[PDB]
Structure formats: C-alpha cells, structure tokens
Amino acid sequence: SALNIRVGGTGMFTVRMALFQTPSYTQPYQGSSVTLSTEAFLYVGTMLDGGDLSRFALLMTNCYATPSSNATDPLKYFIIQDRCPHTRDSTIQVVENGESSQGRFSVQMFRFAGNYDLVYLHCEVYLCDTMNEKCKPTCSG
Amino acid sequence: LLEHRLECGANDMKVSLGKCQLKSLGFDKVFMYLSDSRCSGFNDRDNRDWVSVVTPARDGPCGTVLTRNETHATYSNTLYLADEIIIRDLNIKINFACSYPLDMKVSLKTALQPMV
Numbered sequence: 001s002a003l004n005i006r007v008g009g010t011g012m013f014t015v016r017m018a019l020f021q022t023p024s025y026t027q028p029y030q031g032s033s034v035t036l037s038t039e040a041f042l043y044v045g046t047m048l049d050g051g052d053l054s055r056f057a058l059l060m061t062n063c064y065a066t067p068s069s070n071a072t073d074p075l076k077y078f079i080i081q082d083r084c085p086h087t088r089d090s091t092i093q094v095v096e097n098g099e100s101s102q103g104r105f106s107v108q109m110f111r112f113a114g115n116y117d118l119v120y121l122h123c124e125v126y127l128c129d130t131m132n133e134k135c136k137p138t139c140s141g
Numbered sequence: 142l143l144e145h146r147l148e149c150g151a152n153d154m155k156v157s158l159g160k161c162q163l164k165s166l167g168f169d170k171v172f173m174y175l176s177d178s179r180c181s182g183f184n185d186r187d188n189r190d191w192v193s194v195v196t197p198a199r200d201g202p203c204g205t206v207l208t209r210n211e212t213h214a215t216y217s218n219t220l221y222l223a224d225e226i227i228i229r230d231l232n233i234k235i236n237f238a239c240s241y242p243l244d245m246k247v248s249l250k251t252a253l254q255p256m257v
C-alpha cells in the first residue's frame with residue numbers, strides 16, 4: 001500500500017538594484033543620500049541575486065522615478081514604459097536588457113517642477129525564459 | 142498527525158521532520174531518500190531535534206523538475222521514508238512543491254538630491 005501526503009509552500013528570488021559612476025559601472029554607490037548636479041549622469045543597473053541563473057533572463061519592464069518614497073505616488077517620470085526606452089528625452093540610452101542576470105541603462109539627471117526636493121527610483125521586473133520565449137526587446141519608433 | 146515543515150529558500154528547498162518519529166510508528170532508525178538515491182538525509186539540532194533533506198531549486202540536482210506557469214514557477218520532488226532498508230508493509234512518501242512568482246517589485250533604497 002501507500003500513504004501519500006501532499007504539502008505546499010512558496011518563496012521568492014532575491015533581486016536588487018544599485019547605482020554606478022563610470023562608463024562600465026565600475027564603482028557602485030553605497031551611501032544613503034546622493035548629491036550630484038544636473039550635469040551628471042545616472043548610470044543604473046539591476047541584478048538577479050537569488051538563483052536559477054542558468055534558465056531565467058532578467059527583463060526590465062517599467063522603470064520610473066517619483067518624487068516620493070511611497071511607490072504608489074501618482075507623479076511618475078517614466079524611463080522604460082512598456083519594455084522599451086522612452087524616446088522623448090534625447091539622452092536616455094539602454095545598453096543591455098533581457099539578455100543576462102543584469103539590466104543596465106543610463107539617463108541624465110532631473111528635478112521635478114514645483115515644491116519637491118527628493119527623487120526616488122522604482123522598477124518592475126519580469127523573468128523571461130531563455131529556452132521558451134524570445135526575450136530581447138524589439139523596439140522602433 | 143506527523144508534523145512536517147517546509148522552507149522554500151532563495152536557493153534551496155528543505156523538508157524536515159521531528160523526533161517524534163522515534164515515538165510514532167516505531168521508527169527506530171530513519172532512512173530518508175529523494176528521487177535520486179544519492180541525496181539523503183542528515184540530522185538537525187539547531188532549534189529542536191529535526192531530521193531533514195536538502196535540495197537545490199534547479200532542474201535536475203536531485204531529480205527535481207520545473208513545472209512552470211505564466212505567473213509562477215513550481216519545483217517538486219518526492220521524499221521516501223522507512224524504518225529499515227526494505228519496505229514490507231507501508232511505502233510511505235511525502236510529496237512536496239515550492240512555487241516561485243515571476244513578477245518582482247524592486248526599488249532603489251537610496252535617494253537623490255540634485256542642484257539646478
């Protein structure tokens with residue numbers, strides 16, 4: 001005979017995002033508050049740190065900045081809106097997205113109009129399969 | 142009435158049972174196996190007395206498989222139990238699964254301050 005037990009559970013992959021200060025993302029930033037003028041660029045990369053790195057590709061899908069730390073603020077300045085670079089700002093440049101364990105991009109600095117002095121960054125992340133589905137962005141126009 | 146536990150960690154899954162095994166059903170020794178026989182159990186005394194196995198959450202370390210949805214990703218293996226090398230009256234097994242979502246919300250914890 002056989003006496004079968006079926007259990008369940010769940011967990012999450014750890015995933016992180018960090019800023020950088022070079023051409024090739026040499027020196028990441030560790031401080032808690034960054035003071036840089038609007039002549040300086042914002043080189044930003046993401047990273048997949050959990051596991052199963054052999055199978056899942058890291059695709060950036062929605063990367064936006066907001067003047068408040070709370071992620072659901074209605075004021076959003078978009079950088080990547082739907083899996084594609086925003087082409088209005090003529091300085092945004094995306095180098096790698098959807099091909100490895102890290103997504104990287106580059107914009108120039110801004111400050112929101114009105115009575116605001118802080119800028120926070122937020123991103124959403126989709127994990128696309130390297131073996132089942134095409135993951136590199138196709139974007140024109 | 143056999144209290145199990147599950148810990149679907151970031152890199153590895155873990156199924157563990159307590160030492161009421163020595164009092165339940167007369168299990169004098171504990172043999173614990175996975176779908177691949179080379180993965181076996183060990184002893185765990187960190188908080189209470191536990192007996193556990195360890196599997197990575199990938200495709201084929203200890204014969205775990207990836208069953209994937211469009212919203213989740215679920216790994217699974219099957220554990221085996223006995224009190225002797227040969228089973229004669231009860232083929233006991235415990236089927237487990239850990240699911241993983243594919244849609245993350247990561248935010249940069251540090252803030253900025255520009256000078257115009």
Ligand SMILES: *[C@@H]1O[C@H](CO)[C@@H](O[C@@H]2O[C@H](CO)[C@@H](O[C@@H]3O[C@H](CO[C@H]4O[C@H](CO)[C@@H](O)[C@H](O)[C@@H]4O)[C@@H](O)[C@H](O[C@H]4O[C@H](CO)[C@@H](O)[C@H](O)[C@@H]4O)[C@@H]3O)[C@H](O)[C@H]2NC(C)=O)[C@H](O)[C@H]1NC(C)=O
Nearest residue numbers: 006008009010208209210211212213214215239240241242
């Ligand atoms: C994409 O893939 C993911 C990964 O599998 C799916 O997410 C899981 O969906 C299933 C199906 O709803 C969830 O399973 C659980 O089903 C139980 C009902 O079925 C059992 O119980 C009846 C008797 O009631 C039996 O006859 C039957 O044979 C089954 O054994 C529910 O009871 C569960 O609710 C549980 O919720 C949580 C679990 O952590 C606890 O509070 C309780 O234990 C409670 O019982 C549940 O509905 C499973 O949980 C989902 N996993 C998740 C969300 O991580 C997606 O549904 C799928 N998407 C698709 C197909 O579109």
Ligand SMILES: *[C@@H]1O[C@H](CO)[C@@H](O[C@@H]2O[C@H](CO)[C@@H](O)[C@H](O)[C@H]2NC(C)=O)[C@H](O)[C@H]1NC(C)=O
Nearest residue numbers: 066067068069070071072073074075076246248
């Ligand atoms: C983020 O900010 C909003 C308001 O700016 C906080 O309030 C929520 O507002 C939404 C609609 O915008 C409502 O649906 C929620 O019910 C509101 N929640 C509460 C608790 O009032 C929201 O709480 C903030 N998020 C935090 C603090 O995590």
